[PDB]
Design a protein around this ligand. Structure first.
Ligand SMILES: NCc1c[nH]c2nc(N)[nH]c(=O)c12
Ligand SMILES: NCc1c[nH]c2nc(N)[nH]c(=O)c12
Ligand SMILES: [Zn+2]
Ligand SMILES: [Zn+2]
Lengths: 360, 360
């Protein structure tokens, strides 16, 4: 396998399905990345993450640099070895957790800058490295959005140069740039233009899911995604709810990460094709059905709603484990249905059918 | 398989190795039972419990009756179905958690008595049912020890009769009686005599590990175990540390349960053949070795001390999972080495070698 190759196998409107080939494996797009905060997808062994269908997971640069430490992980062999996940890993850059000077930022639990962020991602042994950016809070005035976007584009060039100057990283990993500009079309365009002039392996749409709500997010995606190079992956960071994913794919997004399936699983929320359920609710106390009637996951093959209800109410670790496994499996099944429907030219109908039942 | 059959395959001194055949499976003795408090061996799926070598697990009557409820579990199909463990389950009776009238006891989180305890164990679908007893606090005066023992023997007969009057339970489960009498040889003998006159499928030594310490516990086992019927299993409830298990087997015990491997795993203590380690200690922060150098468990095949150190310090659920799996696997490997050494007539040497290295 090459360092990086993205191929589109089929299209429907703005939606695409295809593959990213990297040295540690192939990633089927559109892809959902389970989030490994501190070198673990919470409550799951890596084999279990893989069994659900995940091709790639996300690691958080900010958190890993605080504990256990980036240099410590490198000394121990890198993140893949440390946590026992041998497939691709994408690492975010830290600009979200940060949300200061033109050089970068210092904070108390440390320093982050374009150079230091790329270096930490190198120390971890990341396959997909994200450029270090400045993330504008929503809402943002035009002036502030422009200033943060301009800074982010200067930092994208510094990110690019830091990555390239590290031969081992440049030869074996990929680097993605991050579009900014808040909700403003002209800034989004300036940003896209700047990123494409520098050139990246992939392009994230940054700055959304920051409080603007789905309508506004979709409106911004409507004009922002066509500004990115068509022949590279489009990554929407920190999204999201199933309906957010479907609608973002309808608008050209190829990759996703979110803590929702994991976090909400631990809290008692299970995803189903008829919408999420609150497993702690009394209505589930003697319900022998699985979490979801169609789900192929091991949890739904083996345990009832009633049992998982008990586990979560009791604070048992196995409750977290089962909820999380199901939720991640559900998310992967969603992505698989999206991939198959696009390849078969029936994604429009899938989205319609999905929504009518999920929000019945 | 029969309802119940215990066969001794080999002996060395007072130590025995053999099998208990029951309808849901065979139990290799000497046996360690992982404890499932509230319908879960904490942090482990039942398949993982089985993969470690466990033949049987313990369920806590007291806790299950409080949450989720005994009648609720019966309505849902019984404990095996509820939690997804299809092999034998032993349930304790509640007399430990209780530690009042001659009829039984009422308390606030409910009622327990010989009849109600046997009924709850029936509702759960237990394979090995324990008689309901009264457990004397240590230390106990001779007079108090005698009174509690006498009461326990009256309650053993009531337990026996309740079990027998329930045809389904009598035909498919086994009933074990519990010897009491504190540290007093004459009371222990009276108790053994009373239990054997009633007749049970197995005999537990109750009332120990209550603060008397290992020396005293071993002294009491020295005279108490020979009082029990030789041809039935001998169960030491709530024991224990590896060296406690070895010494109890040297004195004729065939079965064990304890929360130590699970509880102490979650807290950061890993068992090793050179003794327990505190994985949170700084000395493990960059240690690439497995938890134990010889352990065959999946955790030690795959992850380092350093990683598990990180997980436990971070409060991650996977830390609990890995620690627990290892500790239960260690305990099963201990039991396997005990079984093999007795069968091969080299258990004396094993015990000696085990102790010299574990306490080096
Ligand atoms: N949801 C927006 C977002 C999530 N994670 C992010 N990480 C970075 N560097 N930048 C961003 O804009 C975002
Ligand atoms: N360690 C003593 C002990 C543990 N669990 C027990 N359960 C019962 N019924 N009786 C007992 O004496 C004990
Ligand atoms: Zn499922
Ligand atoms: Zn191990």
């Amino acid at each position: 396998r090459p360092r990086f190759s993205f191929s589109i196998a089929a299209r429907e409107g703005k939606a695409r399905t295809g593959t990213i080939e990297m040295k540690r494996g192939v990633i089927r797009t559109p892809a959902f990345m389970p989030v490994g905060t501190a070198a673990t997808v919470k409550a799951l062994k890596p084999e279990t993450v893989r069994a659900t269908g995940a091709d790639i997971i996300l690691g958080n640069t900010y958190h890993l640099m605080l504990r256990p430490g980036a240099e410590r992980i490198a000394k121990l062999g890198g993140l893949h070895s440390f946590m026992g996940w041998d497939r691709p890993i994408l690492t975010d850059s830290g600009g979200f957790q940060v949300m200061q000077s033109e050089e970068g930022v210092t904070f108390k639990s440390h320093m982050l800058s374009p150079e230091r962020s790329i270096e930490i991602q190198h120390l971890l042994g990341s396959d997909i490295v994200m450029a270090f950016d400045e993330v504008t809070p929503y809402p943002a005035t035009p002036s502030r959005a422009a200033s943060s976007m301009e800074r982010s584009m200067r930092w994208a060039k510094r990110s690019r140069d830091a990555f390239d100057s590290r031969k081992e990283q440049a030869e074996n990993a990929a680097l993605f740039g991050i579009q900014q500009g808040s909700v403003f079309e002209n800034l989004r365009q300036q940003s896209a233009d700047a990123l494409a002039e520098i050139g990246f392996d992939g392009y994230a749409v940054g700055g959304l899911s920051g409080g603007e709500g789905q309508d506004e997010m979709f409106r911004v995606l409507d004009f922002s995604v066509p500004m990115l190079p068509d022949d590279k992956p489009h990554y929407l960071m920190g999204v999201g709810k199933p309906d957010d994913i479907v609608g973002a794919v309808e608008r050209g997004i190829d990759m996703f990460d979110c803590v929702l399936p994991t976090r909400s699983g631990r809290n008692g929320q299970a995803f189903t094709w008829d919408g999420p359920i609150n497993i702690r609710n009394a209505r589930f106390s003697e319900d022998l059905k699985p979490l979801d009637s169609e789900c192929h996951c091991a949890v739904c093959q083996k345990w009832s709603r009633a049992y998982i209800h008990h586990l979560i109410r009791a604070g048992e670790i196995l409750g977290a484990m089962l909820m999380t496994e199901h939720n991640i499996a559900f998310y992967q099944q969603l992505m698989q249905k999206i991939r198959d429907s696009i390849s078969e030219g029936r994604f429009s109908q899938f989205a319609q059918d999905f929504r009518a039942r999920y929000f019945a």
